[PDB]
Structure 1
């Protein structure tokens, strides 16, 4: 800690201006520690206002800040510790255990800031992640090293969707995962922590295949903003140095936008459209750019996004929409229809779905599905006024297949045993292609609608028909 001592000059919020003395210059993005009964209050230097008077953003609370309070300068971006005991413990923004499993093993420390790898470095994705969720697999197949994006409602099983992913994909792949919570509830935290202790992904004796960095919304906006950057560096340690692929998970990135929006305003920087940061685009962009499939390690982000008032053309979701490789929308309506998952199939679209890429059969089947659903959707309006009473036998059959497909999508989840109490199903990729193919061919047009409802694979569709048949 350099003998640059500053005395606070203005407590006006999280923004705290410090007055370092003459002949001693700070540097942007430093870390100030202020001795307090709050340990060290950490201030990230974010502007220089000259005359050795900085304007810095607080991480921790500014209550009881004494005017002219000595501020040590620890310099540079805050450096957390990283190791492999990062795995299996919850870690706050300033890099300290929240599960109180003692300090994370500090083999290395790294700064929370890091810079995106160069264009040259990038190695492009071209592999297919499997989710075991049939709708997801057919109509928006995910790709390893991807940038999956879970746009969705108010924790409308947003968490549940992720829980299923962790249950299937995370456990399955040997690589690490990092579960990062930006401004999320301690109720949710306790459930997730407990749940992932239960699923054993978190092993509190022995290594965990997940790490946690839970930043919660009671924390001041500054801490909420810069929790993400910390998480990225942990992934980088895994990605680069451990070499291991990271199935990253972050929650919720609208909260990342909101946190940033607040400190834009507080920094005095005029906020752009719908009150977002003036630097909204570039801040999102830097975050997104850091996350990529690198030769050292392929990073597969799954990023929760909360669509404020279910409007995704609001600039913050819409801007993020570009950066995401494999967008997914989880809608209330489909949930309400009783279809789990709540995914809106038309709107959920992954970049890879190209004909050769997913294979001609998969593509052709999916094209037929898309048409079947789109036809059904067109016919819903017709049914609305005209009724289904003068629209073709063929149209009726297409509609019948669509109702069946609609409830074929209804597939339970193991992590909605908590909810529904119905154990989930994992259906092989080949099997899903086959099962959709059969339906379209009309092979299963003698199978009851409810014998597609809340079932898995082809065997199950037939089996629940047999159950009803009996």
Structure 2
């Protein structure tokens, strides 16, 4: 609504406006300050009374002159949704930053949208196999699920997601949303190029993927509502189109982090580690706007930049709570050179059950877990005294486990450049078989190096021959 105001304060990117008329926009309304930098979009976040709101600014605030005229756009920012989104990279505002000009708008929807109700929930049970051995063996995914990754971001974390895109999303087909909060601009450009190359984006034709990209150069405040914008695009697919989607979020640490930055400026008493007090609510709301309703099933992949790789940090901790499966990837396992670097004793899925994937799968997994846990248990003893000073029975276990550890590496085709090894995807049925044999020590008689950086059991057998020469 045309409500003039003046800019009382510009304390960071948290401008405060003072409306001069007694008509006052409500909280989560949006305002445009028009400048020679065009509109700057701000969003009301507090009412501080005396006709003075305090607004988060979703665009950079450098150059603002106090008292500058504001005009209130009214209500939450309305992005444009449709299938016309597919084949666009859109800014937080909704601007087509892939410069395919104005997006043909159908319905433009408010960024803030209440999460669907308890009644609307529909529980999954699907098996989604990625053909990644470690994923398949340890913690199978499911369609509609919330998948989770933890560790250093784009230190292999980004690559993991890229492998997932490469596998899952061609098979899945249909709508898919990639939303990248605070990602490295060059990496995003690579993704854009790659997507166009793999035709998922075909700009000449139609694209069955849409993209939202928020660069890490984008101001902290902008980054906060990149996520909400992406979720709206997803909701249009989930609800209105009613076709199964995909969603990628990288990193949802950036969502939390962005909030913590603005929180201080906003005027909140800092909570532990310095995180915003509204950390629990904001994360909660976000993670319940990503869900599988009876209307539609949205498989989501969420990437958590764990700061200093401390899981005990409250922001990663509260993330762990809202995920349906996680596959924490550890720097230590990275040092061991195992790519994928998923920690095998720190993965879980509610889909790993002896009903869900059957007793035989579960039994296979049980033995892997036990073997590896023993190996972890004897790590102290191994270091202090030689392995020869361990019990003979234990030495068999240790040798088996060393083999299992090496076996778990699966070359990835997206990482084909980096590894220099052509990637291989191994069937879920094949994976269970391969591990079963190894657990029975069938192929335990050939070097650890044979198991190192190679795919399935058959490949190992062949690789023994290669080494033997």
- The normalised TM-score by structure 1 is 0.97
Q: Do the aligned residues in 1 keep the contact of 2:2 with 2:73 (CA within 8 Å)? A: no
Equivalence for 1:180: 179
CA distances 1:112-145 after superposition (whole Å, capped 9, x unpaired): 1111110011011111111111111111111221
- Local SS of the residue matching 1:414: coil
RMSD, matched Cα: 1.4
Contact 1:84 1:105 in 2 (8 A): no
Shift of 1:90: 1.2
How far 1:17 moved relative to its partner?
Answer: 1.2
Misfit runs of 4+, over 3 Å: none
Q: Once the two structures are superposed, what CA deviation does each residue of 1:402-445 show, in whole Å capped at 9, x if it has no partner?
A: 12111111110001112122111111111100000000011111
Structure 2 unaligned runs (5+)?
none
For the residue of structure 2 that corresponds to 1:4, the secondary structure is coil
Shift of 1:309: 0.4
Deviations 1:146-181 (A, max 9, x none): 111111213221110001000000111023221111
Alignment check: 8 A CA contact 2:11 2:265 kept: no
Residue 450 of structure 1, CA deviation:
2.1
Distance, in Å, in 1 between the alignment partners of 2:151 and 2:243 is 29
| Secondary structure at the counterpart of residue 59 of structure 2 | coil
1:13 and 1:311 map into 2 onto residues whose CA distance is 29
Deviation string 1:436-468 (CA, Å, 9 cap, x unpaired) is 000001111123322222222222122212222
Q: CA deviation at 1:44?
A: 0.4
Secondary structure of 2:70's counterpart equals strand
The offset of 1:234, in angstroms, is 0.6
Question: In 2, are the aligned partners of 1:85 and 1:207 still within 8 Å (CA)?
Answer: no
200-209 vs 177-186, which moves further: 200-209
2-structure distance, mates of 1:368, 1:454: 22
CA–CA distance in 2 between the matches of 1:334 and 1:207? 41
8 Å Cα contact 1:329/1:343 also seen in 2: yes
How many angstroms does 1:67 deviate by? 2.3
Name 2:63's counterpart in structure 1. Answer: 64
Output the CA distance in 2 between the equivalents of 1:390 and 1:17: 70
Q: 1:281, 1:104 → 2: CA distance?
A: 35
Per mean C-alpha deviation after superposition, the further-off stretch among 3-12 and 403-412 is 3-12
Report the alpha carbon displacement of residue 200 of structure 1 after superposing the two structures with TM.
Answer: 2.4
> Does residue 334 of structure 1 match 2:338?
no
Determine the C-alpha separation between the residues in 2 that align with 1:112 and 1:453. 48
User: Offset of 1:51 from its aligned partner?
Assistant: 2.7
**CA distance in structure 2 between the partners assigned to 1:380 and 1:66 by the alignment:** 63
Deviations 1:13-45 (CA, angstroms, capped at 9, x unpaired): 211111212232211111111211221111101
Preserved CA contact (<8 Å) 1:46 1:55: yes
The count of aligned residue pairs is 469
Instruction: Compare 193-202 and 354-363 and name the one that shifted more.
Output: 193-202
Distance 2:144 2:289 in 1: 13
SS of residue in 2 equivalent to 1:290: coil
Which residue of the partner structure matches residue 402 of structure 2?
Answer: 403
- State the distance in 2 between where 1:389 and 1:407 align: 21
Report if the CA contact (8 A) 2:27-2:44 is conserved. Answer: yes
Structure 1 residues without counterparts, runs of 5 or longer: none
Contact 2:153 2:304 in 1 (8 A): no
Q: TM-score, normalised by structure 2?
A: 0.97
- SS of structure 2 residue aligned to 1:142: coil
Report deviation, 1:391. 2.7
> 1:346, 1:248 → 2: CA distance?
26
Residue 379 of structure 1 and its aligned partner are, at CA, apart by 2.2
Identify the range of structure 1 (222-231 vs 148-157) with the bigger mean alpha-carbon deviation.
148-157
Q: Is the 8 A contact 1:156 1:332 kept in 2?
A: no
Deviation at 1:295, TM superposition (A): 1.0
Query: Aligned pair 1:91/2:76, yes or no?
Result: no
Please name the residue that 2:4 is paired with: 5
